[PDB]
Enzyme design. Structure first.
Site, PDB file in Angstrom:
ATOM      1  N   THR A  47      -4.567   7.727  -2.033  1.00  0.00           N
ATOM      2  CA  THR A  47      -5.067   9.029  -2.435  1.00  0.00           C
ATOM      3  C   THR A  47      -6.436   9.351  -1.822  1.00  0.00           C
ATOM      4  O   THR A  47      -6.672  10.480  -1.392  1.00  0.00           O
ATOM      5  CB  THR A  47      -5.096   9.094  -3.945  1.00  0.00           C
ATOM      6  N   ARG A 177       3.541   8.805  -3.918  1.00  0.00           N
ATOM      7  CA  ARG A 177       3.262   7.377  -3.852  1.00  0.00           C
ATOM      8  C   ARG A 177       4.245   6.650  -2.953  1.00  0.00           C
ATOM      9  O   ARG A 177       5.453   6.796  -3.108  1.00  0.00           O
ATOM     10  CB  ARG A 177       3.357   6.744  -5.236  1.00  0.00           C
ATOM     11  N   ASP A 199      -7.333   1.217   4.696  1.00  0.00           N
ATOM     12  CA  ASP A 199      -6.722   0.906   3.409  1.00  0.00           C
ATOM     13  C   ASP A 199      -5.985  -0.428   3.458  1.00  0.00           C
ATOM     14  O   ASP A 199      -4.925  -0.531   4.067  1.00  0.00           O
ATOM     15  CB  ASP A 199      -5.738   1.997   2.993  1.00  0.00           C
ATOM     16  N   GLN A 203      -3.244  -7.173  -2.001  1.00  0.00           N
ATOM     17  CA  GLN A 203      -4.371  -8.016  -2.387  1.00  0.00           C
ATOM     18  C   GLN A 203      -4.040  -9.012  -3.490  1.00  0.00           C
ATOM     19  O   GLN A 203      -4.609 -10.101  -3.538  1.00  0.00           O
ATOM     20  CB  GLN A 203      -5.589  -7.168  -2.755  1.00  0.00           C
TER      21      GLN A 203
HETATM   22  N1  LIG Z   1      -4.229  11.412 -12.380  1.00  0.00           N
HETATM   23  C1  LIG Z   1      -4.538  10.675 -11.317  1.00  0.00           C
HETATM   24  N2  LIG Z   1      -3.613  10.091 -10.546  1.00  0.00           N
HETATM   25  C2  LIG Z   1      -4.019   9.376  -9.495  1.00  0.00           C
HETATM   26  C3  LIG Z   1      -5.298   9.212  -9.180  1.00  0.00           C
HETATM   27  N3  LIG Z   1      -5.331   8.447  -8.105  1.00  0.00           N
HETATM   28  C4  LIG Z   1      -4.077   8.160  -7.764  1.00  0.00           C
HETATM   29  N4  LIG Z   1      -3.255   8.751  -8.615  1.00  0.00           N
HETATM   30  C5  LIG Z   1      -1.784   8.589  -8.642  1.00  0.00           C
HETATM   31  O1  LIG Z   1      -1.521   7.213  -8.975  1.00  0.00           O
HETATM   32  C6  LIG Z   1      -0.388   6.712  -8.248  1.00  0.00           C
HETATM   33  C7  LIG Z   1      -0.806   5.425  -7.523  1.00  0.00           C
HETATM   34  O2  LIG Z   1      -1.729   5.735  -6.471  1.00  0.00           O
HETATM   35  P1  LIG Z   1      -1.545   5.180  -4.957  1.00  0.00           P
HETATM   36  O3  LIG Z   1      -2.581   5.826  -4.117  1.00  0.00           O
HETATM   37  O4  LIG Z   1      -0.106   5.277  -4.565  1.00  0.00           O
HETATM   38  O5  LIG Z   1      -1.949   3.630  -5.202  1.00  0.00           O
HETATM   39  P2  LIG Z   1      -2.008   2.411  -4.138  1.00  0.00           P
HETATM   40  O6  LIG Z   1      -0.896   1.499  -4.541  1.00  0.00           O
HETATM   41  O7  LIG Z   1      -3.349   1.832  -4.352  1.00  0.00           O
HETATM   42  O8  LIG Z   1      -1.888   3.046  -2.803  1.00  0.00           O
HETATM   43  C8  LIG Z   1       0.081   7.867  -7.364  1.00  0.00           C
HETATM   44  O9  LIG Z   1       1.188   8.526  -8.004  1.00  0.00           O
HETATM   45  C9  LIG Z   1      -1.131   8.795  -7.282  1.00  0.00           C
HETATM   46  O10 LIG Z   1      -0.757  10.178  -7.094  1.00  0.00           O
HETATM   47  C10 LIG Z   1      -6.272   9.762  -9.899  1.00  0.00           C
HETATM   48  O11 LIG Z   1      -7.472   9.678  -9.690  1.00  0.00           O
HETATM   49  N5  LIG Z   1      -5.880  10.509 -10.997  1.00  0.00           N
END
Ligand SMILES: Nc1nc2c(ncn2[C@@H]2O[C@H](COP(=O)(O)OP(=O)(O)O)[C@@H](O)[C@H]2O)c(=O)[nH]1
Length: 353
Positions: A47, A177, A199, A203
């Protein structure tokens, strides 16, 4: 007077010269800034990357925007599915018995239909299920199982997403996601600076150490999901999800990689936490917590708990921020601030003309 000839010096300089070796002076790029995005999965790393594109790059094009439709459907499917499975797991009653046969027909469809597609018959099943009071009772208890944080967001606008000629809005894209294990990268300009952002996934699985030998890393941006404090551990692992994120952050400061690198804590998902904190006591994650269960004091309490893991006395080096990765306006503020800290602490000699 003669440029190609020459008229300066006295028998000191002879033979062919290498000022085209001093071309590596132009290769001197101190206006280059490398950032690592570390953190547990689902903490908002992707994100943030998306936001970088929206804010500093050209936002997503219409061709790009349409490539998310297929992930956005899968995301929605996967989400309703997760709720439906939890109807039986948590043994919750359907609001209208009839809705039980829709949920059975779904398992069937999901296993047959093409990945990424959302047929009209499916979305109708899903649209009813969502309006059911049982599903909703199960939805509110999302903390007791694995549910996309974007599940609600999507299932609320399911109709808007299945109307033919659907175009993902910047928020929709932001809410999608796609789990990855390798490295996602992005390059963008800001403040006469070229940013290369990395990114780093996997981990909790691999925990590679080669990441250290990566040269030129200005700062480490470590994300934590604030709203993870609530998630109960069926693992029996010593530490739930919040304490797992801590164990990962602990080995980020514990590691004495000596290249000059500021580390920045993103206590992410402050929006979801603001909703949780009122219902679910922060004592669930920290039993010793005497403070009140409100957004300000609990959030701070968590931040402390993370900052308190700081092993090496990093002289003015631990920066932190409450963030909402999906919120553009917010990220624009936090990244302005981060940049302002980068450019000062990791400053090339000032231009001054
Ligand atoms: N409400 C909300 N949702 C978030 C936020 N950040 C990420 N998300 C949601 O959380 C989920 C996981 O985030 P993602 O970026 O896929 O996590 P990663 O596995 O670290 O890449 C996704 O559906 C995002 O849209 C946030 O700050 N607020």
């Amino acid at each position: 007077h003669h440029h190609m000839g020459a008229g300066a010096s006295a028998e000191e300089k002879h033979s062919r010269e290498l000022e085209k070796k001093l071309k590596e002076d132009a290769e001197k790029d101190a206006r280059t800034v490398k950032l690592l995005l570390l953190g547990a999965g689902e903490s908002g790393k992707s994100t943030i990357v998306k936001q970088m594109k929206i804010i500093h790059q050209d936002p997503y094009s219409l061709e790009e925007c349409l490539e998310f439709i297929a992930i956005i459907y899968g995301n929605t499917l996967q989400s309703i599915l997760a709720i439906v499975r939890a109807m039986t797991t948590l043994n919750i009653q359907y609001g209208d018995s009839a809705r039980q046969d829709d949920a059975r027909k779904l398992m069937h469809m999901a296993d047959t239909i093409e990945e990424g597609t959302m047929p009209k018959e499916m979305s109708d099943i899903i649209q009813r299920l969502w309006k059911d009071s049982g599903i909703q009772a199960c939805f509110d208890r999302a903390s007791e199982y694995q549910l996309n944080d974007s599940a609600g967001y999507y299932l609320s606008d399911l109709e808007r997403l299945v109307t033919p000629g659907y175009v993902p809005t910047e928020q929709d894209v932001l809410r999608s996601r796609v789990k990855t294990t390798g490295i996602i990268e992005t390059q963008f300009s800001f403040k006469d600076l070229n940013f290369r952002m990395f990114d780093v996934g996997g981990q909790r699985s691999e925990r590679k150490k080669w990441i250290h030998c990566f040269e030129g890393v200005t700062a480490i941006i470590f994300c934590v999901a604030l709203s993870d404090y609530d998630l109960v551990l069926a693992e029996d692992e010593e530490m739930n999800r919040m304490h797992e994120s801590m164990h990962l952050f602990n080995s980020i400061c514990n590691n004495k990689w000596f290249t000059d690198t500021s580390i920045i804590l993103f206590l992410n998902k402050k929006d979801l936490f603001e909703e949780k904190i009122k219902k679910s006591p922060l004592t669930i994650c920290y039993p010793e917590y005497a403070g009140s269960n409100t957004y300000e004091e609990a959030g701070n309490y968590i931040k402390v708990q993370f900052l308190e893991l700081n092993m090496r006395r990093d002289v003015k080096e631990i920066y932190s921020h409450m963030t909402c990765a999906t919120d553009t306006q917010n990220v624009k503020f936090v990244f302005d601030a981060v940049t302002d800290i980068i450019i000062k602490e990791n400053l090339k000699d000032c231009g001054l003309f």
